[PDB]
Amino acid sequence: KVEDPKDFPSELLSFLSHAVFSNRTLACFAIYTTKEKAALLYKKIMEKYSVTFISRHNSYNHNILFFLTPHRHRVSAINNYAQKLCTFSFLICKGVNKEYLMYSALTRDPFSVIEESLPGGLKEHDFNPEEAEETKQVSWKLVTEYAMETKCDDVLLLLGMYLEFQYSFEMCLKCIKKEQPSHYKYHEKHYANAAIFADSKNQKTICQQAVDTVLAKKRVDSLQLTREQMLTNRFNDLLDRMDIMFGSTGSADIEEWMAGVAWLHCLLPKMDSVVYDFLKCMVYNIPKKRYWLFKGPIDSGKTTLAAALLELCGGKALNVNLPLDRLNFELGVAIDQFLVVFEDVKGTGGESRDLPSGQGINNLDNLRDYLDGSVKVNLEKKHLNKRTQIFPPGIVTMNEYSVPKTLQARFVKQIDFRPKDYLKHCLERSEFLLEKRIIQSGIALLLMLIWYRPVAEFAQSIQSRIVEWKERLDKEFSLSVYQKMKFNVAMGIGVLD
Amino acid sequence: KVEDPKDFPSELLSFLSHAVFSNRTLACFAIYTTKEKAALLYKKIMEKYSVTFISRHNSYNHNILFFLTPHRHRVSAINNYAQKLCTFSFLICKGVNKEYLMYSALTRDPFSVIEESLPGGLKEHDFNPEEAEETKQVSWKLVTEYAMETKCDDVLLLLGMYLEFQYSFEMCLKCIKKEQPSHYKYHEKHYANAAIFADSKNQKTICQQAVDTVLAKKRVDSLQLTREQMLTNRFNDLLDRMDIMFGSTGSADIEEWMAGVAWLHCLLPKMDSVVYDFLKCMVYNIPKKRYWLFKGPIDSGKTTLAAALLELCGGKALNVNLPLDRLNFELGVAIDQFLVVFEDVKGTGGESRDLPSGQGINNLDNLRDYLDGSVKVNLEKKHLNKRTQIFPPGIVTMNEYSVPKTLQARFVKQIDFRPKDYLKHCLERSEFLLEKRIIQSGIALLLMLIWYRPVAEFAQSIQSRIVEWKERLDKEFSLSVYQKMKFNVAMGIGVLD
DNA sequence: ACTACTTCTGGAATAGCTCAGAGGCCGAGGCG
DNA sequence: CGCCTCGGCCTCTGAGCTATTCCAGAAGTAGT
Ligand SMILES: [Zn+2]
Ligand SMILES: [Zn+2]
């Protein structure tokens, strides 16, 4: 610093008048000078205008005098006055247009308070009161903002969540009982706007445009992300869900989920490694080498695992067993998805009978450009614009049908699931694993990684969590408690007992 | 003469805003056109904007319209209106900054009056006052509220419903006859707003948004609340409907409904337990164990019990008797629904009993993916994009058609209904049950859950309300009177009488 | 089916709101 | 004792937002 700043810190500028030549009169001013000069003017100004409020602050080894005047005055006069009392030093006084926000920012770092004609801050020209009967307009900006912070992407959810804020905050059972975080954290703030929102004739539009803005930023921020980064982010959100689940407060017996792991690890040879290999194939996403084929009988695990994996990295599954004149709206669900999963692809005529016939395989054989991922495609939605992008990678699960040579080639890897009675029986005595839908859950798989993969594998950015989580499982499940689960599962009894 | 004024006369430009293209809104405008047009506009402008004052003047072979509007408009809006009114050879619209100076100069030698609103000119005592009130318009919120309290999600229905309140509620037949709940309970309250409503041009819009509100809440709940909660929440709703139903205001004979309980309790063995069972199934939503199958002839009871249970947990009835591809929108109805009911499904092989062959059964077989609930499916809606979720659980009612031992394995419970004579004649002896739709009402099914099942077996949330409702029941209906009803109903005689 | 008529959505166009900058007007006092 | 300037008032305006209306075309529908 040149020891005397040439203007207010760029942290309060948006609250000050941007005028350069105006004879407008204000009632809220802010001077920025030296510690000694401020200290002095604090008393000179106080009486000079019979202020209704005033307060000195600290700013970058200097002072800032924020005061509210009863009557209106133009910065001109306020300035010409403070001048006469200095004759030297630096003095930059301006008009304040954001009273509260200004004072507010000044009471918090990097600004500190020193003096003030009122200990409890203030609420006059500024606010809590004086709201009176001015024209009430809804703030679309504030709705979108909300959507942004809650990373909202569903108009229905938004509309309903915001309508909740319409009600009084102080005595809101929902905020007291603190049921949903994405509510008790934004209500008080969005309360005023919401109440006005409850009267808007454009509710839907306000929400649609909001959610559209979030989807916008999201698609942009993705471009600046690797892909291993996207997976790390996903692992994070999944980990965030987990903290709440197995938390001191929440329905989620960590023991019941570790049971699923013990079950999912017997679904295939070296399960923990497969997932890792899988994840890498999805992260690297290599042209003509980004799809796996899960092939097997009904109730062989190919569906459960595919689902799990699908939730792990995040994404959606689609059903291409339909007329090509309806195959496009379905293919479109893949948009902006990390990975895709073609669930239960059917074939026509094949391998004897008892096998449902369908177009699923035919269709896939006419979507090589979608599987190869060499050239982008035009995924579409209703009433929207044909969004173009590289089709996401994924898995394809199918029964024992005949796969055309052309299609096969697009499957860098094929896994054959063979029914295991010792697994089927184990489940028949573990209702909770199907009840709480744990074997088809990605959280179940993520735990598995945390329990088998070395800390060094996961991204450095979150290795911290992985370690703390790993240690969490160690104390909870000794090399005995868990071994008991694997044993029972291998013997087909009951994961727990 | 050839000029045909490109702008207002120079000596007036001094009181005119020369930025016709702006967002500014004012209440004093001037139009420069020909004699005939001004004369025509004088009348059309007076009506369109219910001007506070208007006058026509002479300006070099042409006319000039000066007028004050009770409310602000932008010059462009005024100009745009005049345009679509008639044809012009030349037209100039400008805002007037200096009101009084504009008029006075228009009466000066250079110009002259031809006609005007108030005989006397724009006297300054009232040439720039305060605008007022602004005609009251329909309250969208208020309509929404109604749709909310009645959980209405049908725009067409809501529209018709709300239009009934337009009429006076004084000598209103429906209001006095206490014929409809969701009418005499709201009419008096919405009368005033419905009156305007009935004259609004956006009726369909208003309702469209009130519905989105109802849809929005369901989307929120399903996304946050747990299956238990949803049910309970549905019970509190049913209870709030029963109170008013059997209340002083209402007109429901609690002694007639309690009869239905006795009848229904004769449809199936341990019926009070079957309902508890059903509820558990629906609430636990366990993969492969979420669907029940009702099979029987007409008035076999299935149609009744199904409908009742459906209302108990609140769900939607579907119809899969369409082409295995034409039912993509009929299945989307399940979106955000607790439970669904595939009513009267048709099959094959019923020719033997004059049972029309359909696609229903064959369709359910190709939707085992939906009935199971192990994976999520993408549900469609007209003009809207796919919704990914696990298809809700429910019931499948069908007549005496054939069911492959492979399809039967898609259901955990199969309640076969058989014709009951001693139960039929009792319905003839008690013709009132059908008339008041008590036989297949979710209310009765709730009462039956109160006249049997334990108290602490309910949710600790609605315990108290169930306790005090279990009072009035026995405290009124003798512990034997019910027994006498559940007797003659097994004989063939009327319930009560 | 392929083609002719209807309902629905999103984006464009149109309209009204309030804020704060750039300046014009004017009584009252400073000063040689 | 009159030019000049201070300091509060007020309005015309560019701007950014919010509110309503319109509209071309896609999504869904009935029928040859
Ligand atoms: Zn709250
Ligand atoms: Zn009525």
Question: Domain check: are A84 and A135 in the same one?
Answer: no
Question: Letter for the amino acid at B217?
Answer: K
Ligand nearest to the CA of B184: 2
Q: Are A75 and A31 in contact (CB under 8 A)?
A: no
Question: Domain check: are B74 and B112 in the same one?
Answer: yes
**Angle in degrees, CA A342, A345, A348, rounded to 5:** 155
* Residues, beta carbon < 5 Å, ion ligand 1: A 172, 174-175, 187
Rg of chain A in Å (alpha carbons): 31
What is the distance between the alpha carbons of residues B305 and B415, in angstroms, rounded to a whole number? 11
- B101's CB contacts (< 8 A; 6+ apart) are B14, B15
Which one-letter DSSP state was computed for residue A224? T
List bases in chain C with any atom under 7 Å of a protein Cβ: 1, 7-11, 14-25
Q: What length is written for chain A?
A: 497
Nearest CA among A34, A40, A90 for reference residue A60: A34
Question: Domain check: are B414 and B290 in the same one?
Answer: yes
B23 Cβ within 7 A of any nucleic strand C atom? yes
Residue A136 (CA) to nucleotide D12 (C1'), in angstroms, measures 25
C-alpha distances (whole Å) from A5 to each of A1, A17, A67, A103, B380 are 7, 18, 21, 20, 62
What is the distance between the alpha carbons of residues A78 and A74, in angstroms, rounded to a whole number? 7
Alpha-carbon B320 to chain mean position: 25
What is the distance between the alpha carbons of residues B22 and A437, in angstroms, rounded to a whole number? 60
* Helices assigned H by DSSP within B86-202: 99-107, 140-149, 155-163, 173-177, 181-184, 187-197
What is the distance between the alpha carbons of residues B260 and B304, in angstroms, rounded to a whole number? 12
Q: DSSP 3-state assignment of B97? A: coil
Tokens of B363: 């369709």
Tokens of B432: 């009132």
Question: Domain check: are A189 and A218 in the same one?
Answer: yes
Q: DSSP 3-state assignment of A490? A: helix
Q: Are A432 and A260 in contact (CB under 8 A)?
A: no
Domain termination site, one of B128, B144, B163: B128
Question: Domain check: are A121 and A166 in the same one?
Answer: no
Q: Are A291 and A278 in contact (CB under 8 A)?
A: no
**Angle in degrees, CA A450, A455, A457, rounded to 5:** 95
Question: Domain check: are B150 and B113 in the same one?
Answer: no
Tokens of A449: 């990684």
Question: Letter for the amino acid at A311?
Answer: E
- Up-side HSE of residue B367: CA atoms within 13 Å toward CB? 26
Tokens of A197: 């929102």
State the CATH number of the domain containing residue A93. Answer: 3.40.1310.20
Nearest CA among A361, A316, A359 for reference residue B325: A359
Q: DSSP 3-state assignment of A232? A: helix
Number of other CB atoms surrounding residue B11 within 10 Å: 11
Q: Do the chains contact at A200 and B140, CB–CB below 8 Å? A: yes
DSSP characters over B262-298: HHHTTTSTTHHHHHHHHHHHHHH--TT--EEEEE-ST
* Helices assigned H by DSSP within B379-492: 421-429, 432-435, 442-450, 463-476, 481-491
What is the distance between the alpha carbons of residues B195 and A265, in angstroms, rounded to a whole number? 67
Residue the block writes with tokens 């007992």: A497
Q: Are B231 and B313 in contact (CB under 8 A)?
A: yes
Report the DSSP beta bridge partners of residue A394.
A291, A340
Tokens of A326: 């309806």
Which pairing describes strands A387-389 and A377-379: parallel, antiparallel, or unpaired?
Answer: antiparallel
For chain B, the helix, strand and coil percentages under 3-state DSSP, each to the nearest 5: 45, 15, 40
What own/partner pairs with CB < 8 Å and gap ≥ 24 does B269-274 have?
A: B271/B448, B272/B448, B272/B449, B272/B451, B272/B452, B272/B453, B274/B415
Question: Letter for the amino acid at B410?
Answer: R
Question: Letter for the amino acid at B40?
Answer: L
Number of other CB atoms surrounding residue B237 within 10 Å: 13
Backbone angles phi and psi of B396, in degrees to 5: -130, 110
Residue the block writes with tokens 């905020």: A175
Nearest CA among A46, A126, A55, A118 for reference residue A82: A46
Q: DSSP 3-state assignment of A440? A: coil
Q: Are A88 and A34 in contact (CB under 8 A)?
A: no
Number of other CB atoms surrounding residue A284 within 10 Å: 12
What is the distance between the alpha carbons of residues A207 and A198, in angstroms, rounded to a whole number? 13
Q: DSSP 3-state assignment of A225? A: coil
Q: Are A399 and A298 in contact (CB under 8 A)?
A: yes
Question: Domain check: are A337 and A359 in the same one?
Answer: yes
Rg of chain B in Å (alpha carbons): 34
Q: Do the chains contact at B375 and A317, CB–CB below 8 Å? A: yes
Q: Are A329 and B386 in contact (CB under 8 A)?
A: yes
Number of other CB atoms surrounding residue B110 within 10 Å: 14
Helices (H) then strands (E): counts for chain A? 22, 12
For chain A, the helix, strand and coil percentages under 3-state DSSP, each to the nearest 5: 45, 15, 40
Q: Are A256 and A443 in contact (CB under 8 A)?
A: no
Q: How far apart are the first and last CA of chain B?
A: 99
C-alpha distances (whole Å) from B28 to each of B99, B123, B304 are 7, 14, 69
Question: Letter for the amino acid at B263?
Answer: W
Tokens of A41: 């003017």
Tokens of B395: 């019931």
Domain termination site, one of B99, B128, B157: B128
Number of other CB atoms surrounding residue A88 within 10 Å: 7
Report the DSSP beta bridge partners of residue A387.
A379
Tokens of A312: 């792990």
What is the distance between the alpha carbons of residues A165 and A172, in angstroms, rounded to a whole number? 9
Residues of B in contact with A156 (CB under 8 A): 212, 215-216, 219-220
Tokens of A51: 């202020």
Nearest CA among A389, A279, A374 for reference residue A335: A389
Question: Letter for the amino acid at B74?
Answer: R
**Angle in degrees, CA B348, B349, B351, rounded to 5:** 110
B72 Cβ within 7 A of any nucleic strand C atom? yes
Number of other CB atoms surrounding residue B204 within 10 Å: 12
Q: Do the chains contact at A203 and B209, CB–CB below 8 Å? A: yes
DSSP characters over B243-265: HHHSSSSS---HHHHHHHHHHHT
Q: Are A459 and A232 in contact (CB under 8 A)?
A: yes
Q: Are B341 and B397 in contact (CB under 8 A)?
A: yes
Report the DSSP beta bridge partners of residue A317.
A341
State the CATH number of the domain containing residue B372. Answer: 3.40.50.300
Q: Are A348 and A399 in contact (CB under 8 A)?
A: no
What is the distance between the alpha carbons of residues B420 and B418, in angstroms, rounded to a whole number? 6
Nearest CA among B258, B208, B280 for reference residue B474: B258
Which one-letter DSSP state was computed for residue A96? B
Question: Domain check: are A290 and A316 in the same one?
Answer: yes
Report the DSSP beta bridge partners of residue B59.
B62
Q: Are A378 and A386 in contact (CB under 8 A)?
A: yes
Tally of domains within chain A: 4
**Angle in degrees, CA B412, B417, B418, rounded to 5:** 150
**Angle in degrees, CA B328, B333, B336, rounded to 5:** 125
Q: Are B169 and B187 in contact (CB under 8 A)?
A: yes
Domain termination site, one of A393, A419, A445: A419
Number of other CB atoms surrounding residue B416 within 10 Å: 11
Q: Are B365 and A430 in contact (CB under 8 A)?
A: no
Tokens of B264: 């229904």
Which pairing describes strands A394-398 and A339-345: parallel, antiparallel, or unpaired?
Answer: parallel
Tokens of A110: 């990097």
Question: Domain check: are B394 and B375 in the same one?
Answer: yes
Residues of A engaging B, defined by a Cβ cutoff of 8 Å: 154, 156-157, 159-161, 163-164, 179-180, 198-201, 203-204, 303-304, 307, 316-319, 322-323, 326, 329-330, 332-333, 343-344, 356, 381-384, 431, 434-435, 437, 440
C-alpha distances (whole Å) from B379 to each of A329, B332, B370, B385, B388 are 12, 5, 10, 9, 6
What own/partner pairs with CB < 8 Å and gap ≥ 24 does A217-224 have?
A: A217/A148, A218/A151, A218/A153, A218/A336, A219/A336, A222/A336
* Helices assigned H by DSSP within A265-412: 271-284, 302-312, 327-331, 360-364, 368-372, 405-409
Residue B324 (CA) to nucleotide D31 (C1'), in angstroms, measures 21
Q: DSSP 3-state assignment of B172? A: coil
Q: DSSP 3-state assignment of B3? A: coil
Question: Domain check: are A220 and A119 in the same one?
Answer: no
Alpha-carbon B290 to chain mean position: 30
Q: Are B451 and B331 in contact (CB under 8 A)?
A: no
What is the distance between the alpha carbons of residues A113 and A107, in angstroms, rounded to a whole number? 5
State the CATH number of the domain containing residue B243. Answer: 1.20.1050.70
What is the distance between the alpha carbons of residues A84 and A186, in angstroms, rounded to a whole number? 47
Nearest CA among A490, A472, A492, A491 for reference residue A257: A472
What own/partner pairs with CB < 8 Å and gap ≥ 24 does B407-412 have?
A: B407/B361, B407/B364, B407/B365, B408/B293, B410/B288, B410/B291, B410/B364, B410/B368, B410/B371, B410/B372, B411/B291, B411/B292, B411/B293, B412/B281, B412/B288, B412/B289, B412/B290, B412/B291, B412/B292
C-alpha distances (whole Å) from A35 to each of A7, A32, A121, A401, B132 are 16, 9, 21, 84, 52
Residue numbers of the domain that contains B239:
225-266+420-497
Q: DSSP 3-state assignment of A138? A: coil
Sign of the torsion angle spanned by Cα atoms A233, A236, A237, A238: positive
Q: Are B193 and B143 in contact (CB under 8 A)?
A: yes
C-alpha distances (whole Å) from B361 to each of A243, A280, B298, B374 are 45, 43, 18, 21
Question: Domain check: are A147 and A186 in the same one?
Answer: yes
Q: Are B401 and B365 in contact (CB under 8 A)?
A: no
State the CATH number of the domain containing residue B187. Answer: 1.10.10.510
* Helices assigned H by DSSP within A390-462: 405-409, 421-428, 432-435, 442-452
What is the distance between the alpha carbons of residues A157 and A147, in angstroms, rounded to a whole number? 10
Residue A138 (CA) to nucleotide D18 (C1'), in angstroms, measures 7
Residue the block writes with tokens 């509210």: A68
Q: How far apart are the first and last CA of chain A?
A: 71
Question: Domain check: are B198 and B59 in the same one?
Answer: no
Tokens of B470: 């279990």
What is the distance between the alpha carbons of residues A236 and B406, in angstroms, rounded to a whole number? 43
